Amino acid sequence: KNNTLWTGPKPEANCIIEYGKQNPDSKLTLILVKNGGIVNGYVTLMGASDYVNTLFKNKNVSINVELYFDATGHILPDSSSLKTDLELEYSSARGFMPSTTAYPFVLPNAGTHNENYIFGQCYYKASDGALFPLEVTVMLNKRLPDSRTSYVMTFLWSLNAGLAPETTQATLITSPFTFSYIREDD
Amino acid sequence: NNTLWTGPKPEANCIIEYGKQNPDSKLTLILVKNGGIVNGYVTLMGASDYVNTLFKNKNVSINVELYFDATGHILPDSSSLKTDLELEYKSSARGFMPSTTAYPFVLPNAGTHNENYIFGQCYYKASDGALFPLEVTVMLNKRLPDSRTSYVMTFLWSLNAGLAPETTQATLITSPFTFSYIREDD
Amino acid sequence: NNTLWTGPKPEANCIIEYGKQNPDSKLTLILVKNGGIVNGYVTLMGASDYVNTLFKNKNVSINVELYFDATGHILPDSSSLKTDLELEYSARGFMPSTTAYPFVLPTHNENYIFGQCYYKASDGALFPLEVTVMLNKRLPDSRTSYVMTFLWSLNAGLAPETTQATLITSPFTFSYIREDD
């Protein structure tokens, strides 16, 4: 009913984690479901390169995904980590965007606006079965990368362990992280 | 229509400080009907020097109490929240209330009464950028405060840290907490 | 209609103690169809001395396995839940996607949701319970078309309880990609 905006359930490599790299090195599953005045979100990232799939050979690691949308809620693929636009399940996608009233854009470097953040946790299950917490930070709007952009949504997964989940290459998977935010008018 | 809320960016509407006379904080609360459950979203922002200095202590508790009449309208005299919720689609808000079958009222006896509680976690980001977990307790119904009340929803954010997050005044903001509960019939 | 569930306050309908003949617990499971996903809500309540004494130990693992047929109905012989879910109205559309979460023959960890809920002990102490949800992945038989398993784990320095007390897992919410209607 128009109510789902997503990457599909099992997307091909569509996302770039590694700075400078020219083609997707990861698979971002992102699902945004419109429900009343909020969006319910579901996001998981799967590695698809040796670089991404060896990140957890280190104890401290940060993975950033930046999504920038235009005025009609379509991805700007050049600047975004995600290189393919989201699609509706069943035209404008403005109504899935984060509210600029609840999560306003602010003056670039003036004060602090922690009103624009969602924090949470998901996990990485290592090849030996050990489960490591990943701290999740979602930033909504707040700040523009350029003057072409109308909406912002960034994800940061952060691991800080006494130990490195891995000593070898292993398929990176962030366990599903769910979240909700106040959506813009349709 | 299927959303009952305070709006996305409410003016000070909630009293934290005991004895205080007018709102000292901004409560954002959004309740969305989703089949037989409600999906909830809640965050609290400080709007007074008292609230905005609580995090100078390492152990803090913040209580918000909401009491609703038989048609799911706030009772402002007894509730922490002094302005009623409104529907996005401008009748009864009964269908948004926590089920008295799932979350019963019981005799005022000491006890854990676990069935009436939802536990979870949200966060406070301090001025220095440090992230503090806040333990969240949601109580549904369980204890009637008087003969005027038909539904109860209370929130507690607890901080118990080894170090206080702040040494100075800073805008208190609870990162968004989401939860779901079984709702009453419309 | 858009809700598939046990109901809000079910009678004993679930078996936790392996080999036991009848329900020893009350599983509340609520699955709401929301666009391309299901939003789930699950809590377990003990209803036997065995279940209600588990938390006298520091290490506790509670497992529930749900096996569904092709039209999304519980297989009670093999499932921990002995009564089928009901619509508030085929429930295939409520089932976990075999595209997102495929069955496989034996590393494959995309089939897991991890999280936390809690147990409040009689003395008021709050204990976190580590939650693992597994979707499909392992096919036990030919009668089964979808799998949904829950594991609640406590590993504590100390035991929530010295005596019998009603086991209640605080509500755990989760979301997964659903199969086509």
Curated annotation (Swiss-Prot), chain A:
It is found in: Virion; Host nucleus. Induction: Expressed in the late phase of the viral replicative cycle. One of its GO terms (biological process) is adhesion receptor-mediated virion attachment to host cell. The keyword Repeat applies. Its main location: virion. GO terms for cellular component: host cell nucleus; viral capsid. It comes from the Viruses. Keywords: Capsid protein, Host nucleus, Host-virus interaction, Late protein, Repeat, Viral attachment to host adhesion receptor, Viral attachment to host cell, Virion, Virus entry into host cell. Belongs to the adenoviridae fiber family. Homotrimer. Interacts with host receptor CD46. Interacts (via N-terminal tail region) with pentons. All late proteins expressed from the major late promoter are produced by alternative splicing and alternative polyadenylation of the same gene giving rise to non-overlapping ORFs. A leader sequence is present in the N-terminus of all these mRNAs and is recognized by the viral shutoff protein to provide expression although conventional translation via ribosome scanning from the cap has been shut off in the host cell. The tail region anchors the fiber to penton base capsomers, whereas the shaft, built from several repeated motifs, allows the knob to protrude from the virion. Forms spikes that protrude from each vertex of the icosahedral capsid. Interacts with host receptor CD46 to provide virion initial attachment to target cell. Fiber proteins are shed during virus entry, when virus is still at the cell surface. Heparan sulfate might also play a role in virus binding. This is Fiber protein. It comes from Human adenovirus B serotype 3 (HAdV-3). The chain holds residues 129 to 319 of 319 of the full protein.
